[PDB]
Amino acid sequence: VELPGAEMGKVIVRFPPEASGYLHIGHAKAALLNQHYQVNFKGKLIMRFDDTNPEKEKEDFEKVILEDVAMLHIKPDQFTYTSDHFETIMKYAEQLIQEGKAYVDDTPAEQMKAEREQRMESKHRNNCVNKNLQMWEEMKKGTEYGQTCCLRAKIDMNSNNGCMRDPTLYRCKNQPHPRTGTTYKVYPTYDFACPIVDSIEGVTHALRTTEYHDRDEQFYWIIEALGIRKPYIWEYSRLNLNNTVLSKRKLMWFVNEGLVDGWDDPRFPTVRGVLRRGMTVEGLKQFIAAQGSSRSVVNMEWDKIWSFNKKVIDPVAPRYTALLKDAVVPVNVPEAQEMKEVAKHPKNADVGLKPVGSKLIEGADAETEVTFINWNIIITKLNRNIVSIDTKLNLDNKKITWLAETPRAPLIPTVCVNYEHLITKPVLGKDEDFKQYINRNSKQEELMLGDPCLKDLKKGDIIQLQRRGFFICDQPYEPKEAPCILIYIPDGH
Ligand SMILES: [Hg+2]
Ligand SMILES: [Hg+2]
C-alpha cells in the first residue's frame, strides 16, 4: 500500500459515484480504499455526485447512496456535485475553442465512429475559431441543429490510444437539470469532467480501476492544455467475484422476474444485500485491506471474503440454541425442578451470560446410552411409532443441545434461512449469459424453536446457533405472531 507523494494532512481523495442505483460490492471497495488513505494520512475525503448528465441521475438514489456510504461507516469531510462547477467547466471549454484546441462537429455518430477506428480526421477538425464559436452558441442556445453537434478536443487522431482521438467534451441535452435547471443546454462529458473537477477540488490522488488506464493520457492532456494543477492517478484492481453479476440491467432482470424480493435481497451483491446477509463492515474492510492496491485481474471466490468475516464474528458472537419443530420429540427427565445463568461465549467472558427442568430434543438427535452442554443423562426406554423418550439422571461422569419446555421461559418462534448463488456457474462469460444458469430455487426456510434469550434479538445482531453455525437476525420477534428470522452466514471454504 505505497502511495507516492503522500504527506500527513495533505492527501485529498474522493469517491465519485453517480446517483443512478444502489451501491454494490465493487463500489464498496473503491470507497473503502479511499477511506483507507483519508484515515492513514489524516487527509480529506470528498464525496462527489457525478451529476453531469441531467437524465439518468435522480435525487432519490442520492438518498440511497448516502445511506449506503453511512452503513459502510465512511464519514466524508465534504460533499459536492460536479454541477457545482458547470460555469467553470464551460469557461475552460470556451478557452480551448479560443486557442483552437477544440472544434464543434455535427458528423453523424456511425460515421464519427468509423473515422475514429481508421484514424481519420473529421470534416470539421480544421474549422477556423469563429466558425467553431458560431456552432458553439448554437449548442448553447439548445437549437435543433445544435442538438446534432458535439464539442471535441483537438488531440491526435493518429494515436495508439483511442482515448486521444479527439474525444467529445460537451453534448447537447434539452432536459432541465435537477440543480441548475434550464440555465444550461449543454453538459460536459465525464472525460472532460474528472480532470477539471478533481483539480478545482484539490484532489491529490485520484483512484481508478485498471480498466481505465487509457483515460490518463487524455486527462493529463486536458490538464496541461488548461494549465491547472495535476493530481496523481492511482490504480487498483476491480472486483471479479464468482457467481456474481454487477450490471444494473442484469440485476433488475432478477428483480422483475420475481426471483429476488428487492434490491437488498441477501443474494444480491449490493452493499445492502451483503450486509443483510451477514457481512460485517470490519470483515469487509479487512479483506479490502489485505488487497491494498494489488493490481491483478483475478477471479474471486466469495468464500475468501466470508473467511475474513468468520474471524471477525467468531470471537464475540453469543451462542444461543435452536431446534426444529416438526422433527422434535418430547423428553421426560424427572430429577430437575427449576435456572442456571451460564455464559454466552465459552471463551470470552465479556460477551455476557444467559439464563437457562423436566421436558425437548429433535428427530436427528433421537438416535445419536450414557454428556450435556452447560451441564450426563441415561435414558430409560423409547416408546415407539419415536414420539417419546424418558430417562433418569446423574451429573457424575464423562455434545447435545436441548430446550427445556419450562413454563417460566417459553421458547421463541424461529426461522432458519439459507441462500445460495442465483448464478450457478462461477466464472461465466465467453459470450455466454447468466439468464440460463439460474439457481431457480435459491432459498429455503426451515421452521424452528429457539432459546428464550432470543426474545431480545435486534435486527442486525449476530449470534451463533449451536451445532449449526453463525446467524444474523433478519427481523426480531414481536407478540397472529411474527417469528425471529435468522439468516445463515457463510463461513467460507
Ligand atoms: Hg459527437
Ligand atoms: Hg477512451
Author numbering: 188 to 525, 527 to 544, 547 to 549, 551 to 559, 564 to 565, 567 to 571, 573 to 582, 587 to 599, ...
Structure paper excerpt:
Aminoacyl-tRNA synthetases (ARSs) catalyze the ligation of each amino acid to the 3’ hydroxyl group of the cognate tRNA and thereby establish the genetic code for protein synthesis. ARSs assemble into a multi-synthetase complex (MSC), which is comprised of nine ARSs (arginyl- (RARS1), aspartyl- (DARS1), glutaminyl- (QARS1), glutamyl-proryl- (EPRS1), isoleucyl- (IARS1), leucyl- (LARS1), lysyl- (KARS1), and methionyl-tRNA synthetase 1 (MARS1)) and three auxiliary proteins (ARS-interacting multifunctional proteins, AIMP1 (p43), AIMP2 (p38), and AIMP3 (p18)) in vertebrates. It is a class 1a ARS and has an UNE-I domain at its C-terminal end that is formed by tandem ~90 residue repeats. The overall structure of GgEARS1 consists of an N-terminal catalytic domain (acceptor end-binding and dinucleotide-binding domains) and C-terminal anticodon-binding domain (proximal β-barrel (Pβ) and distal β-barrel (Dβ) domains).
We also determined the apo GgEARS1 (residues 176–706) structure at 2.5 Å resolution. The helical subdomain (stem-binding domain) connects the catalytic and anticodon-binding domains. The electron density map of both the Pβ and Dβ domains showed significant disorder in the apo GgEARS1 structure, indicating that the regions are highly mobile. However, these regions become ordered upon binding to the IARS1 C-terminal domain, which consists of three repeats of a β-grasp domain. GgEARS1 contains a distinct hairpin loop unique to vertebrate EARS1s in the Pβ domain. This loop is located at the opposite face of the tRNA-binding surface of EARS1 and is oriented perpendicular to the longest axis of GgEARS1.
